[PDB]
């Protein structure tokens, strides 16, 4: 069995204007096998309504998924993505940077 | 430009807790228009793009019939492959299939794909001539010989060269507004100061379709690499994609560097300078 | 359009 560890990109659907409606995205790619756990967190608390795309894979047979929810960016608030995978010894958390 | 239609199948076996999970997704260019889930309550082929929804109830019944038949195929394939490698029953294994067709700007046949994967490795694939097979290992050779005698390549070759091209053309015309459009990137530049002596420059491309794009860093008209950071292209979530490139520059030398963007949406390659 | 032919490994 070949196993590939996932790549995580946390960003926003639109340029992050504070106090306005936007979508928060988590893009996991370059991972195998398909079983993966991805959560979106606001200040360490799980967000209830989080949708995701349909399972597909790249040319190298690696799987990719996009998790998204609606949110309002605020100077006070912090957002992040929690991704757990068999290849990961511990759940990897990536914080949201509006500049990336 | 050149267009393509691709189907991606994933079947994962759950030892114990039930039957294998089967996921099917269909793409035209970079847009997904159909999906099927074995654990979905509908148990039917569902539409994911607005332009495909205008198909008659006869179309969906046929597509639902074939995807379910293909799902039964890969569940048998999982058992057959487990015997091939002498693998234990207790393990969970994944099988994946991908076949697709390529057309040029003229909209006629260009290229074809048929590939199979077991547990994340290439298993058996159809060559570009559409008449020969490549077998990864000994277990793959057993399947190759059976498929060669049964003329599977010839039946498949007929689908890519003819059946796909006809339906790919039909799909493009039905959704001319959605997938024959080209969206130019929305470009801007940002400045980040790591320290007193060197700063980071960020090149942004946003809200563009199709996904393929080229971003290059040039210093004084010289291609700059290895000192740059490049992220994988990302989906925005509204049918548009995003990508950015960054380079580390010493202070006072920001004006030397230039960002060059090449996309189909842009009639001229764009140049971005920090000033 | 999905592949109309069925195959087994």
Outline the secondary-structure elements:
The complex is a heterotrimer of chains A (100), B (275) and C (9).
Chain A: E1 7-12, E2 22-31, E3 37-42, E4 45-46, E5 51-52, E6 56-57, E7 63-71, E8 79-84, E9 92-95
Antiparallel strand pairs in A: 1-2, 2-7, 3-4, 3-8, 5-7, 6-7, 8-9
Chain B: E1 3-12, E2 21-28, E3 31-37, E4 46-47, H1 57-84, E5 94-103, E6 109-118, E7 121-126, E8 133-135, H2 138-149, H3 152-174, H4 176-179, E9 188-193, E10 198-208, E11 214-219, E12 222-224, E13 228-230, E14 234-235, E15 241-250, E16 257-262, E17 270-273
Chain C: no helix or strand
Instruction: Report the top-level CATH class of chain A.
Output: Mainly Beta
* Percent in strands of chain A: over 45%
Secondary structure tally, helices of chain C: 0
Integer count of domains of chain A = 1
The end-to-end span of chain C amounts to 22 Å
SS field, number of helical segments of chain A: 0
Q: Note the quaternary state here.
A: heterotrimer
Structural class of chain A: mainly beta
The succession of helices and strands of chain A, N to C, reads: EEEEEEEEE
Which percent band covers the strand fraction of chain C?
A: under 5%
Euclidean distance between termini CA atoms of chain A: 34 Å
PDB class: immune system
Keywords: EBV viral peptide, brlf1, HLA-A2, immune system
Assembly: trimeric
Entry title: HLA-A2 (A*02:01) bound to a peptide from the Epstein-Barr virus BRLF1 protein
